[PDB]
Amino acid sequence: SIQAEEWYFGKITRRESERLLLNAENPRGTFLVRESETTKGAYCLSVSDFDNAKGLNVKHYKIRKLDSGGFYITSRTQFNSLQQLVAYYSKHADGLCHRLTTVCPT
Numbered sequence: 001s002i003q004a005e006e007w008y009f010g011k012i013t014r015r016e017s018e019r020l021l022l023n024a025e026n027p028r029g030t031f032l033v034r035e036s037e038t039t040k041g042a043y044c045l046s047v048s049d050f051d052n053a054k055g056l057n058v059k060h061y062k063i064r065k066l067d068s069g070g071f072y073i074t075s076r077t078q079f080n081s082l083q084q085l086v087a088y089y090s091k092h093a094d095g096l097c098h099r100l101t102t103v104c105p106t
């Protein structure tokens, strides 16, 4: 269950997610999952990044959920669960700003 996952922050806004992620103590890959503000049924993965050009910054990725069952950021790479998707992205950066590392502090 998603609401049981420590990285699921539920109904929090984009600005709130950025407020939580823009903490200097957060290494790259700090993240959380929240409801999509615009697509019913979808979610968003907010991830902290850091580079010399931009400094500490946040990126937001839309996670689609199919009625057919698949969860994915890109339709080419789908998962049977949100947990599996998180697990996979904690190991592969792929198109993400950084692989997922630790859950964002509240």
Ligand SMILES: *C(=O)c1cc(C[C@H](NC(C)=O)C(=O)N[C@H]2CCCCN(Cc3ccc(-c4ccccc4)cc3)C2=O)ccc1C(=O)O
Pocket: 014, 035, 036, 037, 038, 039, 043, 044, 045, 059, 060, 061, 062, 073, 074, 093, 094, 095, 096
């Ligand atoms: C969630 O809040 C959400 C997010 C988005 C997309 C987001 N836009 C905004 C307005 O927040 C956005 O544009 N994010 C970027 C992230 C940076 C990369 C560029 N792209 C395109 C993209 C996305 C993902 C990949 C990828 C990732 C992993 C594996 C393979 C490929 C490549 C390219 C972005 O999307 C929209 C809406 C919402 C919402 O809350 O509703």
